[PDB]
C-alpha cells in the first residue's frame, strides 16, 4: 500500500528562505518561520494566509507549537527564543541566555517547559510562565541541531554536528545515553516517535535511522534521498499509512514505508532544498517548505 499525495496549495509570502513548518496540534493552523525574521500563520486545510508575527531581530531557524495550539516558540540567530501568544500576536517572553544562535526549539507535552539548542553547543530548559532558564546542559561539542521531549516530558533528546544524539533526564540534567553508529557524520535532526519508544535521527551522510532508545541500537535505516548539508526535519506520518517523511537536497519530499523502509512516494514541485516538512495531526496532509531560490510552502493531500 502506498499514499497518493498531490499538490493542493502553494503558500507564498516569506521574502527569504523558509526554515520550518509545523501544524498546530488542533489541526487548524500551519506556522512557518523564515530567514526573513518572520513567523507566518496559514490555514491548515485551505492554505489561506492568516497573519504575520514579528519581533525577532535576525532570521528564525525554528518554531514550535504548545500542546493547546495557543502558543508558539521561535529560535533565532538574534540568540533569543520568543514565546508568542498566537491569537493576539503578542510576544509574551523573550528568552535570553544562549551565547550564540538558537537553532532549534520545542515545548514539552505539558507546555510548561521549553527546550532549546544553540550554536553555543548547549541545551537550555526554560520555564514557559516566567521566561526563566532553569538548566543549561553542556550537551555537545558542536552546534545543537535538534531538541525534543519524549511523550511524558521526562526525557530530552538532542542532536549535534559533533555526531552524537544524547538523551537527558529533564529533571536532573543528567546524560542518560549517547547514541552513535559505525560512522560519525554530523547529526542534523532528531525526534522521539509518537509512542516514545524510538528516536528518528537524520545524519549528513544521506541517511535517516530509527533507533530503539532503550536498547540503544539502530533498527531501521531509510535511504534514497540527498542530505549532506542542511538540517532537514523528518516526520512520522500516522494518519493513514505509517510513513517516514523528509525533505531532500534534490528539491523533493521523500516518503518511506516505516516498517519496510521502501520509498513509496516522492513529491516534486519545489525549486530549492526542501528544508522542512510537517504532517497534519488528523488529515493525510503534508506541508513542505523550501530554501532561498524557492521561498514557498506547499500543501499536499492524500487519499492514503
Amino acid at each position: 500500500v502506498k499514499p497518493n499525495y498531490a499538490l493542493k496549495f502553494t503558500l507564498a509570502g516569506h521574502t527569504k528562505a523558509v526554515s520550518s513548518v509545523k501544524f498546530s496540534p488542533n489541526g487548524e493552523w500551519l506556522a512557518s518561520s523564515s530567514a526573513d525574521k518572520l513567523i507566518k500563520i496559514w490555514g491548515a486545510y485551505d492554505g489561506k494566509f492568516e497573519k504575520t508575527i514579528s519581533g525577532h531581530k535576525l532570521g528564525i531557524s525554528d518554531v514550535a507549537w504548545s500542546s493547546d495550539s495557543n502558543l508558539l516558540v521561535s529560535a533565532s540567530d538574534d540568540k533569543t527564543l520568543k514565546i508568542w501568544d498566537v491569537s493576539s500576536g503578542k510576544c509574551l517572553k523573550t528568552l535570553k541566555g544562549h551565547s550564540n544562535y538558537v537553532f532549534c526549539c520545542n515545548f514539552n507535552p505539558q507546555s510548561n517547559l521549553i527546550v532549546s539548542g544553540s550554536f553555543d553547543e548547549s541545551v537550555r530548559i526554560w520555564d514557559v510562565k516566567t521566561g526563566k532558564c532553569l538548566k543549561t546542559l553542556p550537551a555537545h561539542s558542536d552546534p545543537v541541531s535538534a531538541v525534543h521531549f519524549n511523550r511524558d516530558g521526562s526525557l530530552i533528546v538532542s542532536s549535534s554536528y559533533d555526531g552524537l544524539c544524547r538523551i537527558w533526564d529533564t529533571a536532573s540534567g543528567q546524560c542518560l545515553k549517547t547514541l552513535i553508529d559505525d560512522d560519525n557524520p554530523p547529526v542534523s535532526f532528531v525526534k522521539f516517535s509518537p509512542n516514545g519508544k524510538y528516536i528518528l535521527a537524520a545524519t549528513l551522510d544521506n541517511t535517516l535511522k530509527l533507533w530503539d532508545y532503550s536498547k540503544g541500537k539502530c533498527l531501521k535505516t531509510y535511504t534514497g534521498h540527498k542530505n549532506e548539508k542542511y538540517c532537514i526535519f523528518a516526520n512520522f506520518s500516522v494518519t493513514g499509512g505509517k510513513w517516514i517523511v523528509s525533505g531532500s537536497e534534490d528539491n523533493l519530499v521523500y516518503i518511506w514505508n516505516l516498517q519496510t523502509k521502501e520509498i513509496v512516494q516522492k513529491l516534486q514541485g519545489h525549486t530549492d532544498v526542501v528544508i522542512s516538512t510537517a504532517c497534519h495531526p488528523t488529515e493525510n496532509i503534508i506541508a513542505s517548505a523550501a530554501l532561498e531560490n524557492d521561498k514557498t510552502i506547499k500543501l499536499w493531500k492524500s487519499d492514503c
Binding site: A17, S19, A35, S61, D77, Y101, F103, P143, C231, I275
Partner: peptide, 7 residues
C-alpha cells in the same frame, strides 16, 4: 538570513 537556511 538564518543558521538553518545557511547550512
Amino acid at each position: 538570513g538564518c543558521a538553518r537556511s545557511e547550512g
